[PDB]
Amino acid sequence: FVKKHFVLVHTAFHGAWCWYKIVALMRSSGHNVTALDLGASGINPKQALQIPNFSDYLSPLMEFMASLPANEKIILVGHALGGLAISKAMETFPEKISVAVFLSGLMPGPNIDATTVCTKAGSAVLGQLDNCVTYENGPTNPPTTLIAGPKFLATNVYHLSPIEDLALATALVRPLYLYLAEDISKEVVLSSKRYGSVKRVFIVATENDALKKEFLKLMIEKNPPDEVKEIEGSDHVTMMSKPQQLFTTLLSIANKYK
Amino acid sequence: PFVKKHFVLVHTAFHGAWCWYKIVALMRSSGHNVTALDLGASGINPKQALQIPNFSDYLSPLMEFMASLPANEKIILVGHALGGLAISKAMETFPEKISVAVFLSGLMPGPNIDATTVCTKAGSAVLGQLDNCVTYENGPTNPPTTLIAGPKFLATNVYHLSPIEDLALATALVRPLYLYLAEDISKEVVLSSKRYGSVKRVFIVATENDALKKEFLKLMIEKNPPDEVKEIEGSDHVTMMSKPQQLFTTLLSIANKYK
Ligand SMILES: CCCCCCCCC[C@H](O)CC(=O)OC
Ligand SMILES: CCCCCCCCCC(=O)O
């Protein structure tokens, strides 16, 4: 038994809270775990309008990474949109990361742009079901924030999870600032010397959405990781629908890339 | 003979609407209406504790909700621990809108045992306990400003009979509580027999509560008698975590009895 430090980074609308099943399994197995709230997520004190720059969204992860002595290595796990956060962390602090894990994560590289993966990810959320946008920059400006609706969550995100986790999410999801493509492209710049030197595992976890699976496959083709793993029977929130399986998989990954 | 009901759930200190998630799912699945509220600077409420030094602002999300309720709609109002103060004020202001009020290990002040007596006693069971700590944002010459629940205190006194994942959830979500002045609470929560006292009232005891001692709960029940006292065995302080199904069936029963 070697004690390891997992750092968990959530997706859009979510927070540290969404990892609670995983955090519990990690803590009782004796491992260190940090689940972070990104900007204006979970109980982070910022509101979405206060973090209109993508660097502001990422700062809780970047501050945490900065506070790490270089000898204290981590397994860095990014879920969906959280892939962009972990990619930035990989570029800035490549030495501190044993292995980065992309859980159906946006995984841009040199051959597939950060703005490319974003526009595609956004198309599957913007205008879907009961999702709605706000216009705090006024009616003649692009929409400012996106709010995940309860039907969208039930149908597209939590559709294989226990009903109580849907209720939990409905009480906790927060708006996402609609970051500009230009902002993101400038912020998430990746090089093969820094980002590319970090060991990288992709976990494919999706069901009943073959187009989403194709998007994940495309990112894997354009930016080949060191290893691809699969979890069956997962909805969009694998930490909710397949917690034991995700835990086992992360431990296996951690043990392989010490 | 299904009758659709409206449950309104009010959390305790440090918590938010999120703590009721198991109960919310059970209620929504059976077709009942349920609102789980965040009080000021709780859960995902946008205020920070320091921004809300007045107890009125802590309570405002409930009071605004109560005011916006449609004509002739009655609610089952459920308050957990500190949430008891909030529902008591709601009972005094809008007695007509409440079918029955449920105090779940709740602070239950009355005309004979006022809000400040109850608060001072509650404070002693939380302040200084294990790894709980206070902040001094107004400097050392002023009273402490906020109270922060510690992970050890949560594990030992609050979540000890709950699934370990619920403790993990809590530690990622608990927020500071502003240390509201006794004088402020006294002015905000004043209860009369013809208003507060006219609302049907049930107290639910958690048998293994290690946050609020039974001697204090016995004092409140005697000096401010409810219409009924119910019991959930093997429950820690957070009944909605440790005994969710039992709490649910009890709430339905209460709702059916006083409808
Ligand atoms: C004087 C005003 C300060 C209010 C004192 C806090 C009382 C908290 C009541 C419970 O004993 C603690 C709890 O609910 O567990 C999370
Ligand atoms: C143009 C920037 C795109 C912002 C929208 C990102 C939504 C991603 C949601 C998700 O992957 O769970």
Side-chain angles (χ1 to χ4, degrees):
Chain A
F1 176 79
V2 170
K3 195 184 178 175
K4 294 159 191 80
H5 189 191
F6 296 91
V7 182
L8 313 173
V9 183
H10 60 81
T11 190
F13 320 124
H14 287 71
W17 58 267
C18 79
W19 297 99
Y20 77 106
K21 294 179 196 182
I22 305 307
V23 165
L25 287 169
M26 284 173 174
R27 279 173 188 165
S28 50
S29 74
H31 292 289
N32 194 5
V33 59
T34 310
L36 288 171
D37 287 329
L38 298 176
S41 314
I43 59 163
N44 179 279
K46 299 289 181 172
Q47 309 305 304
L49 247 60
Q50 293 152 22
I51 55 162
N53 306 120
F54 198 58
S55 63
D56 300 333
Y57 186 64
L58 298 189
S59 74
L61 174 62
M62 298 307 283
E63 284 166 31
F64 174 86
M65 291 309 292
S67 77
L68 278 177
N71 66 116
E72 296 178 8
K73 305 267 193 281
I74 60 164
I75 299 96
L76 184 58
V77 183
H79 174 229
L81 186 68
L84 299 183
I86 71 160
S87 299
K88 179 67 172 182
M90 286 158 80
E91 185 66 15
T92 312
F93 303 99
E95 299 321 326
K96 316 195 182 178
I97 304 159
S98 303
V99 54
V101 184
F102 290 75
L103 176 56
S104 301
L106 304 185
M107 197 177 57
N111 294 144
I112 184 156
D113 227 55
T115 188
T116 292
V117 294
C118 274
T119 318
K120 201 152 206 175
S123 75
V125 189
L126 276 155
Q128 288 291 100
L129 283 80
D130 58 348
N131 290 346
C132 76
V133 292
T134 60
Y135 287 91
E136 286 98 341
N137 303 313
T140 60
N141 273 322
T144 303
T145 77
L146 170 65
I147 299 162
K151 290 180 198 173
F152 169 79
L153 290 173
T155 313
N156 294 190
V157 188
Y158 283 78
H159 58 102
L160 296 174
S161 292
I163 55 155
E164 65 267 26
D165 295 321
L166 172 61
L168 183 61
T170 59
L172 289 173
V173 288
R174 297 183 61 188
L176 177 75
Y177 193 95
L178 289 166
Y179 298 103
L180 302 160
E182 189 273 347
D183 182 20
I184 290 164
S185 60
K186 262 179 68 196
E187 194 62 31
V188 193
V189 174
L190 309 168
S191 64
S192 41
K193 274 291 174 291
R194 306 202 88 201
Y195 166 92
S197 72
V198 182
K199 296 292 179 188
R200 189 153 43 86
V201 185
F202 198 94
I203 304 174
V204 178
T206 178
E207 296 299 352
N208 319 327
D209 192 350
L211 279 181
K212 176 85 149 173
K213 194 167 177 168
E214 286 304 314
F215 176 38
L216 301 185
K217 280 164 74 183
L218 181 69
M219 290 185 303
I220 288 162
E221 179 186 296
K222 299 298 179 200
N223 183 14
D226 295 284
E227 190 181 359
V228 173
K229 281 194 149 178
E230 302 215 336
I231 293 167
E232 286 176 36
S234 170
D235 56 16
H236 190 71
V237 279
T238 318
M239 66 286 288
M240 297 289 194
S241 54
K242 291 290 165 178
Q244 188 56 47
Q245 293 82 1
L246 177 57
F247 169 69
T248 300
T249 298
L250 293 171
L251 266 191
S252 173
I253 288 160
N255 278 127
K256 187 171 174 165
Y257 306 91
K258 302 212 177 210
Chain B
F2 187 79
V3 175
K4 195 185 187 198
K5 294 170 192 86
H6 194 168
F7 296 93
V8 180
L9 312 172
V10 185
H11 60 84
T12 191
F14 320 118
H15 285 65
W18 57 267
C19 75
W20 297 101
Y21 78 108
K22 301 172 179 183
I23 306 304
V24 166
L26 291 170
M27 278 161 182
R28 279 172 186 168
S29 168
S30 31
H32 294 293
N33 201 7
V34 50
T35 312
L37 290 165
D38 284 328
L39 298 178
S42 306
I44 64 158
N45 178 272
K47 297 292 198 189
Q48 313 308 307
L50 295 173
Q51 302 175 146
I52 58 161
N54 302 138
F55 194 58
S56 208
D57 294 317
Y58 186 65
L59 295 196
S60 71
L62 173 58
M63 298 310 287
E64 286 173 30
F65 172 84
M66 291 305 297
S68 84
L69 276 174
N72 301 325
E73 200 184 313
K74 289 260 202 67
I75 59 162
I76 296 95
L77 187 54
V78 188
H80 178 228
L82 188 71
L85 291 188
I87 70 168
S88 297
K89 182 181 178 69
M91 292 157 77
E92 183 63 27
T93 310
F94 316 93
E96 78 280 355
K97 297 182 183 201
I98 302 157
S99 176
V100 53
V102 183
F103 290 75
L104 178 64
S105 297
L107 300 194
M108 201 174 55
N112 269 288
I113 179 171
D114 67 12
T116 192
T117 306
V118 174
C119 278
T120 303
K121 285 164 167 57
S124 296
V126 190
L127 286 158
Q129 286 287 126
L130 298 163
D131 61 345
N132 289 354
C133 69
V134 296
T135 59
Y136 288 90
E137 305 296 299
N138 293 152
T141 177
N142 290 293
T145 42
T146 71
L147 177 61
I148 299 160
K152 286 192 180 71
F153 165 81
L154 288 178
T156 308
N157 296 29
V158 189
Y159 283 80
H160 78 289
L161 298 166
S162 297
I164 51 156
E165 66 267 22
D166 292 327
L167 170 68
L169 181 63
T171 65
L173 289 166
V174 290
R175 295 179 65 189
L177 178 77
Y178 192 91
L179 283 169
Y180 296 105
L181 265 51
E183 176 212 39
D184 180 13
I185 298 153
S186 293
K187 287 171 187 169
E188 288 296 330
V189 189
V190 194
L191 311 165
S192 66
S193 210
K194 193 180 169 292
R195 297 182 69 83
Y196 166 92
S198 68
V199 183
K200 302 295 189 183
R201 176 157 50 90
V202 180
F203 193 100
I204 303 174
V205 177
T207 316
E208 299 293 318
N209 202 318
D210 283 355
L212 292 167
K213 291 193 172 194
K214 75 159 75 72
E215 188 252 23
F216 169 47
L217 302 158
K218 278 162 175 280
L219 190 81
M220 296 192 296
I221 286 159
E222 184 200 36
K223 276 166 181 169
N224 185 21
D227 293 281
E228 192 173 330
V229 184
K230 295 192 89 76
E231 188 162 287
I232 291 169
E233 303 197 294
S235 174
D236 55 27
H237 188 58
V238 279
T239 313
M240 72 288 288
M241 301 290 193
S242 59
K243 296 290 170 179
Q245 188 64 47
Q246 295 92 328
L247 178 57
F248 173 67
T249 60
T250 301
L251 290 168
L252 293 188
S253 176
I254 290 162
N256 279 132
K257 182 170 166 58
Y258 301 98
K259 68 155 181 282

